[PDB]
Design a protein around this ligand. Structure first.
Ligand SMILES: Nc1ncnc2c1ncn2[C@@H]1O[C@H](COP(=O)(O)OP(=O)(O)O)[C@@H](O)[C@H]1O
Ligand SMILES: Nc1ncnc2c1ncn2[C@@H]1O[C@H](COP(=O)(O)OP(=O)(O)O)[C@@H](O)[C@H]1O
Ligand SMILES: Nc1ncnc2c1ncn2[C@@H]1O[C@H](COP(=O)(O)OP(=O)(O)O)[C@@H](O)[C@H]1O
Ligand SMILES: Nc1ncnc2c1ncn2[C@@H]1O[C@H](COP(=O)(O)OP(=O)(O)O)[C@@H](O)[C@H]1O
Ligand SMILES: Nc1ncnc2c1ncn2[C@@H]1O[C@H](COP(=O)(O)OP(=O)(O)O)[C@@H](O)[C@H]1O
Ligand SMILES: [Mg+2]
Ligand SMILES: [Mg+2]
Ligand SMILES: [Mg+2]
Ligand SMILES: [Mg+2]
Ligand SMILES: [Mg+2]
Lengths: 371, 371, 371, 371, 371
């Protein structure tokens, strides 16, 4: 019949039917209340703005993100986003089609149980599933081996997979993603005197970094060139028509991926975290993981991120190993296309968690993995 | 049934029923006592002249204005003007029809409380409301976005509105208006030897500026042309039949709008005040305000005021922004037609402050804004 | 070398060199033609009488005043008065010494331009200046702060000054002065049956008020005492030897200063005009103006005018403010001594309008104020 | 020898030698031009008034503040203030003594580079340093741990410090300070009809809030008491001698500290910002920060601000934590006394940026932090 | 004279003189560098924190462990820990007293040679020895037979001993210890949403498991009780004052001892490893080993670990064998007290490796075992 695949993670909700080549719905997943004055409810001024209208009428709204570090925080408000996706954006009657929800690894169980209970209680979904983003992201390439390095707006995580088996003892999760690169760019742009404070202005810095930034191949040489010369400097126009000149900051923001120290995060970068998750694995595997290192999600679409990563992990692993980094076009949709394949896969149809089965067996059903 | 809308501000009282295309009553709102001799009360010489009779029999009267800078000063005398409006000019029995009164922003609370208490105590109005002139002025265009630049005889003020929301943190109010341009013209006309002193003669200079004056597109070029040549000079006939020649003064009076320094007022002009009230607003809004800059009220009917304003704000804001200044015909009635629409609007009928509700909840009721 | 200072205002021409303690020339500034019969010109009967001879041979002459409300009206006749001052009274050759002319504020520009053009055209003055009487009047005290309340025969005006700066937005000018008090006394003396009609008889009432009148401290008590008793009555001898008894009228004439309604003038008195010109000024100044309120000119030499004024403004201003009214002796010469100081002041010598400079730059030169 | 410490921030310049117990110079740091008329430069009327003379002769001057939100805006005019401090107020020859300048955190680099370049170029300071106000403010207590909550006229900021180490990843900066509380009081005082407009009148509201205001312990109870009763009302005398009655407004102005929504600022209050900057820090630290929460600067001298703050953060943090707020007397001088200690500290003498070192190494020297 | 015994293994350094009943020094053996900012070395901020100060000032430090799996990794940093132990903690002059160092079995020879070379080169120890922890642990009981099951922070190992002879062909070593149980608890506590990431937070989970955890007698029954009921749940307070509720996790962490599969370790548990090391031994011995099964070290102090172990090995070995598990109090000090006895034993004094003997015979001396 149909299946509805939703990348439910932080930032863009991607949703729309399986059996299609691209998402049908993509919208920022923000919720906004009128800031300046209490709502003129007697005249019917709508007090909630979710998804697209919020960004369209950004300046008057307290834009809240209801998913923070991949953990759903506001349950009253996340349900408004699902409400909007099914009834307004897709215009699909949700009681009729199964829904494949997706999650980060190593989340609190309570978040999966609430997310399930709502879908069975208020939307009355007929059948449902919660998958892990890094596994779906692999089907999108057609491969059955690789270390899926998945970035995002909220959570970065690695899931090595081999011969279709999933290794659950070497999943890694960082808390480093586009929201932390945005909160860093908002701090390094004040060195030029541009000062963004409110959430609406954050939704402008979240657009600067999308276009202007690029990953410096060698960070310590570009910190020379950006000091001696101004061919690196580039200019961008704000909504009001004022022009920014962004210069040096243009490549320091993605650098924090590789140096989490910059943001105060005591961690390995993403290059040391892929390498650690490989070294943790058995010695027999590693020559196959090095050859199949797949990337997905935004904050892995900066120009040249692959060409740096491959050099930077090459500097760690032995020189007898060829290292190829599979960064296909449309990484932004990798997880959704993985859902659009896996939901149409003829073997999968036994894994759906039928509403009846949850109603009788109780919420612990959701943690089963008879995959 | 009906609603009575009154522009109660300084200068012309505009009044007459909602559901009509134009005011039914327009009269100068002056009060006058016989000056020269104490009134022959035993013979019944009427000692008060309000509205039209005062201007008709101007020369013998001490014309007082009971509203000064939008603040009602004489409570004994303002009530004579409402008395005259309801009983003599409209000939409407006021106990029967709700009345929508209008106010400047940032007025003292005490002025709204007295104005309410009189309407409920002596006129016994059945239901009443006090609105802000710059919000009503926007409905008159049908728009739901724009920076309402409202001039007048007493108070100039800006109210940006967006998507029907009102931003109350960026209302600005100046104290610069037709009464200050009149008091300036009375001072620059003495350079030609015409000297107007009494209030009756002020009600002649208040008519000179209405007809003779115009806004110079470029002030510093016209101060050349008016020096080298006399095509700029123009002539006007007084009530007694003597002819004035007004020359250079003809365009210096509206110039004080843009240069409040001229009148001793330490302020931005109206071009810097619209621009400041825009810059104060959030960056996301500003491209929409620049496109919807609405004007209202007299002292915004001088020929070419729009065509200067648009150049003068264009000189401030970025050159990527189109700036359109919406100065419709009948700016003089914009606020009244806004009242004639808003009072007939089907959603508004819950906002009336019923007499019973004020009688029980006490005068603090008038500051509520469940709009 | 020298400078010639002239109080050119209405009534007494005061003239004579700077660097002296008192005017050298003081004379009534009247012009007179033989009234009764056309002049016996073939026998050489002199048809013009200016200054002192006119008053000396008053009774046969149509005494005209060539300055009316501080505006020069007869240009053919005012030039006779300057002619007489330089050649006959001072006996000074005017081509040789600079002349500091003085003016009322808010005069028509044309009056300053004609007054300049004559001095450069017919007298061929080498260098010249036109100052404002109320500024000069302040130097006479040595102060650099105060509200200069300047009376006169023609024009009353206020000029607040502070720290040597002049505030040009709070100059006030009334049209109320000794000529209007004379024309009022000529009307209230007919209540006793004395009737003065001709201009010569006006030059007698202008001498009655100088001696007999005084300012009543409390007007409404003296209108009692003058009704119940006759210690207030006083007697004066006319030129022919007839005795007047002036009684009640003795203090009603200066009262019109404080109540311009009496003369049909719709105005604040001088006590409300000083107070209005203070209230107009910035709040930071006012405690300094109240302490430095200077008086000058005749019609401010009536006995007790200061002691009333100080009570009458004390009744307006707040009771925390000390109010001191600086009425020095020789108020009549205050403006002239101010000229005799300012013309000898070493900084001033750059402000002279050299004849060459007017000849080349044209009559608009006279309005410059690089003071 | 000596060291000159200057709190260069917005509002009061505090300056005077290290090794003393209190500033030797304290003056408002305003610059003023004569407003009403263009300066009589040929007579030598001084056209600039900085520091004390400006406030002394307030009413005639366009008081500009050359530091706005801690960012120096007018470079031509700020240099007049340093000129006045060194040559006129301290009468110290600046080529001879090192100067410790102080700054807000997160300022634009360009502001530090200009501020340095001027001190080395025009004053020719022999050696100089730019420190951060919140670090110096801690030495003033003698502590080596605490969350320095520093308010001011321009910028509020938090700097947690622990064991003498500075954590640079949890500095927070708001744009909320005495200038915004003044601009709010000027808006809420119009509810009583007092209307202050010009900058001179702002320098009176900036004195009202200093004396009359106090922080309400419980805002929502005092909004009851101020409604039912008038023991809360208090009265104050203006320079002219008129008395204000300030009532309800008396405690709503400091409330905006805790509720930035009131001023249109979308932010946490200062109570949520200290708590956020603590929660951001590592879990091991927090019990030590709660015990050492230091306050400094004006707008942290309102009566009872500490006793509210301690309750309001106690409502957030866990109840097992004792919270002590160290608000010593002379918070106004905390930063200056910190400079007077740190500039005399024997270890510091290697951190001075010698003029030679800047001349050779170039302006990037100023961002080094070999602290 | 004296002898200095040091448990040099991972986690707590235990040190202090032989001939005493308990260690004199016990401290975490961590090394820490300031994380957040490069050290202010010119001011003398100490850049190294070892032992107790590191844990005391935990939150600002990158806590590194210099011993990893019983192998010394950082030679520059381990020497700082010996430096601190001898000079600061014991305050003993090390050139004067022999030192008995202790080691895991089956270590790389290079680790013993470096450890020896440092003690003879930089500390200049007069005489020294490296013993094996599991042999010393037996003397602590006074027994001369038993299978010493020694746990720790780094290495678990078995050494069967019989009649004082050591069997070197049945030493077993696992890589499973308190550091792996900590890294597992940090992963299972995220199921409740508590997420510990940094090393400082690891030093809090390393304290949770010390107090809250206990060994479930029957794991599969307690996984029932913890599902049906909440008497098992227990609560603990963090340093900041926030309370954890730990529940189910409380007994799954020590379970990984018995099921190394849980941590991804392909191994027998400790119950199968004691049993394998017994079965490997000759049939004549085994009835004596079963009766003398001694435990030592932390991660063998969890409540009830003995009472489970004895049941779980009883399930393997024949039912004719009595099995007694000798878990005395103060297992944490067993190895140190074994050193404090063996170093005072009169026969041992010939086994010291004199400095002279190493200087002449070369580093291969350290592997001799003329025991
Ligand atoms: N073309 C791009 N270049 C750089 N960054 C991008 C680009 N597109 C999106 N991003 C950023 O990547 C982040 C995550 O996007 P996305 O992968 O859609 O999140 P999720 O996968 O959780 O929906 C967002 O901050 C987004 O702005
Ligand atoms: N056609 C005109 N041209 C110029 N000025 C005008 C014109 N009509 C009115 N004005 C002046 O505008 C001022 C305000 O008029 P109005 O807008 O009616 O005041 P309000 O809106 O407060 O009633 C008055 O001084 C009036 O004389
Ligand atoms: N002693 C006096 N008492 C009252 N009024 C006087 C006295 N002297 C002069 N006046 C009147 O004051 C008027 C103005 O005189 P004056 O100040 O000389 O005029 P101006 O200053 O314009 O020359 C004249 O009417 C004069 O008669
Ligand atoms: N006693 C006081 N009570 C309340 N506010 C004060 C007091 N003294 C000063 N202020 C206000 O605090 C603000 C900042 O003062 P200050 O701390 O000197 O600024 P800075 O530290 O930047 O020099 C000013 O607006 C000042 O008026
Ligand atoms: N009372 C206890 N209960 C449970 N575990 C403990 C206890 N005390 C210590 N541990 C843990 O045992 C581990 C090893 O401690 P220890 O035996 O001192 O190591 P070593 O013997 O190598 O010095 C450490 O992780 C320690 O936290
Ligand atoms: Mg994603
Ligand atoms: Mg109007
Ligand atoms: Mg005079
Ligand atoms: Mg400060
Ligand atoms: Mg041990």
């Amino acid at each position: 019949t149909t299946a509805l695949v939703c990348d439910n993670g932080s930032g863009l909700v991607k949703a729309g039917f399986a059996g299609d080549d691209a998402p049908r719905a993509v919208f920022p997943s923000i919720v906004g209340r009128p800031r300046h004055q209490g709502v003129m409810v007697g005249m019917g001024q709508k007090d909630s703005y979710v998804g697209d209208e919020a960004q369209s009428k950004r300046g008057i709204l307290t834009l809240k993100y209801p998913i923070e570090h991949g953990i759903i925080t506001n349950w009253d408000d996340m349900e408004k986003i699902w409400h909007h996706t099914f009834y307004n954006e897709l215009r699909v009657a949700p009681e009729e089609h199964p829904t494949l929800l997706t999650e980060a690894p190593l989340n609190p169980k309570a978040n999966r149980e609430k997310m399930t209970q709502i879908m069975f209680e208020t939307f009355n979904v007929p059948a449902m599933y919660v998958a892990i983003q890094a596994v779906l992201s692999l089907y999108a390439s057609g491969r059955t081996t690789g270390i899926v390095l998945d970035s995002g707006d909220g959570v970065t995580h690695n899931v090595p997979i081999y011969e279709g088996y999933a290794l659950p003892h070497a999943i890694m999760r960082l808390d480093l993603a586009g929201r932390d690169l945005t909160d860093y760019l908002m701090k390094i742009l004040t060195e030029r005197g541009y000062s963004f404070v409110t959430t609406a202005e954050r939704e402008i810095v979240r657009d600067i970094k999308e276009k202007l930034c690029y990953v410096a191949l060698d960070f310590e040489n570009e910190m020379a060139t950006a000091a001696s010369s101004s061919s690196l400097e580039k200019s961008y126009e704000l909504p009001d028509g004022q022009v920014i000149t962004i210069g040096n900051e243009r490549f320091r923001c993605p650098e924090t991926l590789f140096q989490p120290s910059f943001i105060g995060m005591e961690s390995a970068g993403i290059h040391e975290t892929t390498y650690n998750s490989i070294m943790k694995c058995d010695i027999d595997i590693r020559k196959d993981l090095y050859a199949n290192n797949v990337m997905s999600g935004g904050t892995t679409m900066y120009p040249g991120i692959a060409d740096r990563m491959q050099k930077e992990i090459t500097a760690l692993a032995p020189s007898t190993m060829k290292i190829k980094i599979i960064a296909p076009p449309e990484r932004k949709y990798s997880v959704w296309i993985g859902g659009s394949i896996l939901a149409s896969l003829s073997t999968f149809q036994q894994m759906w968690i039928t509403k009846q089965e949850y109603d009788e067996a109780g919420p612990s059903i959701v943690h089963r993995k008879c995959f």
